[PDB]
């Protein structure tokens, strides 16, 4: 229910990333890499949250704004709990964190995020030196700065032309909805007067036969914008089109579909810029190793033409999807002072105790452990099933607690000898609960 940015701290770095090593740093083609480790004070609690903002410069996602998901909540490695749950409001740039009971359940609780993020050219209009990134971490900002390099416009003669992908959703392997993309041309950026100007957008490139670019009236969809006299068009492609003039309608009778994947746009006589946007469909594949080619060329009277174009790789994520899934149990040993069987606040972990899973049915060991400082343990890598979770090498002078009490599995112990069930999901209930009975030495008399 609580703000709380200054009960927490963190030791941050924010760098530019030259995806592409160029030497040159464009916001298409290159990112910025966040990590930072954070500590929480004992004082949060659950349902406190805190935020991480970013400056206008930034956004969380490139071409594709489903990848916002790779962004999400904040685990903890050791032990595979959930520590806080992430929410973004990416129109006010910001993720907001939820703790969870776990910082009721645990003390000195520390954080790490390993983000890759991104450029926003909204800002950004053109080259320019300098230009600053920043993030902030509960109250503390960090910065760090870039020499942002565009590429020229490409012309020949009077004509000139620019474009790029802005948005690209490519779901491949799937064949009732492969996703889409956008891209955008500008025509005209020099503001020449041309006579019989015409814009061909097409996929299709002779050197790219294999190419899940598509174009046609069925699937695509065009908007045009008009800008006015001398205005500065965004080199990152980032549009606002509440500046420009939408005259998509005085276009109906001007937009021709063609072969082999085009479209032709017939301006006639014009000395203003315009953008031209194209909404189309993905082509269904199951190549593996998708790409996407669209080119742009506009021609007009007593000029040789120009063409430009974008292409990107995707990657086939469906096909192989890497052996199936594995999942992980575990999770922890405590010391149940209550001696009630059951985890409670208060109580803490205990180290050192040798964990072992087997496959019930199957065979034997599939995989074993040791408890860490805070008790927690996990094993990775395990397939839906059953398995037999063994403890051992419990510290000397402990003894198990009574096994599941109450109706909780969550909260329970297990005992040194169980079988849980993993399916779909971790199981992290394979607990067990030990105390130390007071010294019992010698005689008595
Ligand atoms: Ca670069
Ligand atoms: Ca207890
Ligand atoms: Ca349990
Ligand atoms: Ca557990």
Known sequence: SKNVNDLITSNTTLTVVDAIKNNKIVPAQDYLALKSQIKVDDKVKSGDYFTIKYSDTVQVYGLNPEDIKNIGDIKD?????????????????????????????????????????????????????????????????????????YPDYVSRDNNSIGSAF??????????????????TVYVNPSEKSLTNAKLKVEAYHKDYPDNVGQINKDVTKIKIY??????????????????????????????????????????????????VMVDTKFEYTTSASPTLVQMATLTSDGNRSVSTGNALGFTNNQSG?????????????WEDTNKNGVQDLGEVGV????????????????????????????????????????????????????????????LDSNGVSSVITVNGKDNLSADLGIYKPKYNLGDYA
């Open 77 to 149: 490695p050791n032990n595979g709990e959930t520590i806080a749950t992430a929410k973004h409001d990416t129109a006010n740039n910001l993720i907001t964190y939820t703790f969870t009971d776990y910082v009721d359940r645990f003390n000195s609780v520390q954080m790490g995020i390993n983000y890759s993020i991104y450029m926003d050219a909204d800002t950004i209009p053109v080259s320019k030196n300098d230009v600053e990134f920043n993030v902030t971490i509960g109250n503390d900002t960090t910065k760090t700065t870039a020499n942002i390099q």
């Open 166 to 183: 802005t948005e690209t959703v490519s779901h491949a392997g799937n064949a009732e909805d492969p996703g889409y993309y956008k891209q």
């Open 226 to 275: 008009q800008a006015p006299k001398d205005y500065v068009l965004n080199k990152g492609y980032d549009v606002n089109t509440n500046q420009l003039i939408d005259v998509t309608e005085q276009f109906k009778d001007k937009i021709t579909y063609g072969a082999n994947d085009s479209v032709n746009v017939d301006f006639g006589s014009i000395n203003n810029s315009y953008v």
């Open 321 to 333: 999807g890497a052996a199936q899934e594995v999942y992980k149990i575990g999770n922890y040993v």
């Open 351 to 410: 180290k050192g105790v040798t964990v072992v899973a087997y496959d019930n049915a199957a065979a034997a060991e599939v995989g074993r452990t040791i408890t860490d400082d805070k008790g927690g343990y996990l094993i990775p890598n395990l397939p839906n099933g059953d398995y037999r979770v063994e403890f051992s090498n419990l510290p000397q002078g402990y003894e198990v607690t009574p096994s599941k009490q109450g109706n909780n599995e969550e």
